[PDB]
A paper describes a structure:
[name] (CHS) and chalcone isomerase (CHI) catalyze the first two committed steps of the flavonoid pathway that plays a pivotal role in the growth and reproduction of land plants, including UV protection, pigmentation, symbiotic nitrogen fixation, and pathogen resistance. The production of these value-added products also offers the prospect of increasing the value of the crop, especially because many of these compounds are soluble and readily extracted. This study characterized the enzymes involved in the first two committed steps of the flavonoid pathway, CHS and CHI, and the non-catalytic protein CHIL. Through crystal structure, molecular docking, mutagenesis, kinetic analyses, ITC, and FRET analysis, our study provides evidence supporting a revised catalytic reaction mechanism for monocot CHS and CHI and identified an intermolecular interaction of CHS with both CHI and CHIL in a non-competitive manner.
The [name] mutant PvCHS was generated to investigate its potential impact on the local conformation and confirm the catalytic role. The asymmetric unit contained two mutant PvCHS molecules, as observed in the wild-type PvCHS. Importantly, the catalytic triad remained stable with a distance of 4.49 Å (3.2 Å in wild type) between the Ser-170 hydroxyl group and Asn-342 carboxamide and 5.57 Å (vs. 3.2 Å) between the serine hydroxyl and the Asn-342 carboxamide. Nε2 of His-309 was 3.84 Å (vs. 3.2 Å). The noticeable changes in distances are associated with the shorter sidechain group of serine than the oxidized cysteine.
Numbering used by the authors:
A (entry chain B): 6 to 395
B (entry chain A): 8 to 395
The structure:
């Protein structure tokens, strides 16, 4: 009645670009070393008699380029739940009972670290973006995390369920609009993935699911995003310049994922590394041409480590310097494939190594960077990042 | 090129505007007057006469005249596990909704896109919201294919949201259309009850009441900033958007996706809790605008149930005409979860047209859209009508 909508819009809106104010990561305590996983996995699933199948899983884990992973699932638990140890056995209820609890709990550990580095009180958080691919529930994990952290009972929550490995970029793309369109907004972004929904025994008939057993790991990464940082009170890490999403052509059913009574099952049709390599440059050009940037070796890289073959085939297609994917490959080695949370681990790794290596910026000395998310549909999320002087 | 130069050229200017609304439902229509007989027949529960009497009272007090349901008596005959109260059936239910949910959303999206009149290539964002099943790639991907939208459309997949997500999608579309020059957000809420349909159980009347209220439907809305005065005709403006959790409302509405499907659980007094807090939500949204006469703003309230509307309307002594659109959608469609408030929007502007009302908001200037759902979550969207 007093103010007009244009006056509200003018007042409501923020200035400046969405900025990463803090990054925090967390994993389950239980740590499984990749060198020992073929024996561990084949023992807990009672499959040591399938010798030829175990030999293939050994080479699978050898090619994985993963040194270790963290998993909430323990041998003691798995001994009590043979329905989650067989390849195809009704067990979704058992799996949901775990993830609907542990996924929010692990996200709290990651967000607690991000908030402590942030230094501001939780009460300043105005937006919560929670993303997971491990189970669904109502109220969602976003509700669980809010209660666990004690966030304001008016936080604008966004719950990303069953998204897939590309959601790491989707959450940044979402946070970018939330922080930039609302003046004092402070967005807590949380990705949390626990493999208890996809863990299952081996089968010589469904080898695509076997690679998942060699790559998927548990973990959560939290990020605090906001525009117009408070100087001397907040420490800008990266800037979210732009975000785009796209579907690669001829990639229709490349990676399918179905939530059934046997839990979450993944199905691999078509060459995923090849499909990404053939089109990565086109994604790079769409995001950096209006920027006047052509040298793909002049920008710091953040790529979802879906598998070592994806990294190799993209690094070879565009002739990347082997230092550009150093942070990406490092996270894959110490954590495995953690689905959406992976790209947020690499961000934390890149900035951590940069400050420890005396780089000029948080982006390995470079100014501009690119963040790639890869997942079902052959969806590619592309986020143009910018570093901050160190 | 510096980041600041990007930000200035990349963000939109005016307020987020609803440019079109389209709705769609399954063909099969089921009349509330016959549902007690039908429901207890297909579920083979006619031996529970005392229960059938309770259900009949549920349906008669529901203020629902008819509902649309993809589930047919023929299909239910071939799937007795979905007619039982608790029997393994998630695979069967998923097989339906992963296919029909995007398809029903396509029917509504076609309508909306037609009224919009612009080429489908101009759609830059897609927000897909459903509580009926999950899949990878999600329903957003299937709809992108079905509609022929551009690859590179920015998709947001809202799975397993609940009955408050009608407001959620608007909140999302608002920030998307306002921060990005040229963005045109296609918003689709699509719900199908084949994931919650189940037989009756004397020990769980709360699940039984869901069987009397929930219905199928999809609604599409096209949201954009800075409309084209020539090619585009605005319908509503999204001024603000806010979500909040209601105190002492823990466990009021729970929903679990299990091997027997999606089961709903009811604790506490949902209408009493929403009525007890509705005035705080109004004041929080409208006090900074100088508004305090709830009778002089149009209303779009999620019709989670008749009691909710009655008790909210009684709390603020609402002019009974303020809920006519909400209650009509409830009567003619039932509780379609997230899509409800969008159906109500469409019925508001349409009734506003054939009535000779000065605005799309029943002649009024400012309005409120409420979404109610699990966590006792309340979404509050402040709207502004458009002159007719």
């Amino acid at each position: 009645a007093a103010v007009t909508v244009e006056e509200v819009r003018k007042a409501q809106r923020a200035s400046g670009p969405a900025t990463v104010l803090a990054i925090g990561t967390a994993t389950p305590a239980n740590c499984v070393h990749q060198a020992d996983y073929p024996d561990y996995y084949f023992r807990v699933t009672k499959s040591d008699h399938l010798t030829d199948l175990k030999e293939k899983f050994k080479r699978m884990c050898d090619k994985s380029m993963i040194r270790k992973r963290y998993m909430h699932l323990t041998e003691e638990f798995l001994a009590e739940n043979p329905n989650m140890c067989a390849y195809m056995a009704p067990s979704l209820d058992a799996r949901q009972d775990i993830v609907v609890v542990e996924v929010p709990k692990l996200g709290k550990a990651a967000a607690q670290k991000a908030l402590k580095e942030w230094g501001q009180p939780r009460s300043r958080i105005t937006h919560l973006v929670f993303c997971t691919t491990s189970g669904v529930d109502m109220p969602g994990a976003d509700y669980q995390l809010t209660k666990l952290l004690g966030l304001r009972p008016s936080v604008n929550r966004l719950m990303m369920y069953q998204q897939g490995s590309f959601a790491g970029g989707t959450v940044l793309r979402v946070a970018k609009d939330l922080a930039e369109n609302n003046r004092g907004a402070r967005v807590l972004v949380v990705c949390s993935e626990i493999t208890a929904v996809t863990f299952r025994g081996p089968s010589e008939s469904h080898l695509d699911s076997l690679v998942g057993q060699a790559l998927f790991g548990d973990g959560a990464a939290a990020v605090i995003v906001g525009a117009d940082p408070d100087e001397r009170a907040e420490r800008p890490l990266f800037q979210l310049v732009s975000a785009a999403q796209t579907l690669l052509p001829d990639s229709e059913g490349a990676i399918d994922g179905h939530l059934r009574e046997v839990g979450l099952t993944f199905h691999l049709l078509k060459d995923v590394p090849g499909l990404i390599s053939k089109n990565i440059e086109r994604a790079l050009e769409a995001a950096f041409a209006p920027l006047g940037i052509s040298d793909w070796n002049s920008i710091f890289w953040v790529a979802h480590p879906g598998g070592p073959a994806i990294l190799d085939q993209v690094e070879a297609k565009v002739s990347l310097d082997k230092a550009r994917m150093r942070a990406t490959r490092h996270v894959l080695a110490e954590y495995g494939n953690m689905s959406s949370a992976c790209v947020l681990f690499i961000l934390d790794e890149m900035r951590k190594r940069s400050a420890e290596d005396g780089c000029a910026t948080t982006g390995e000395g470079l100014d501009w960077g690119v963040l790639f998310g890869f997942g079902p549909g052959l969806t590619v999320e592309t986020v143009v990042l910018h570093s901050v002087p160190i």
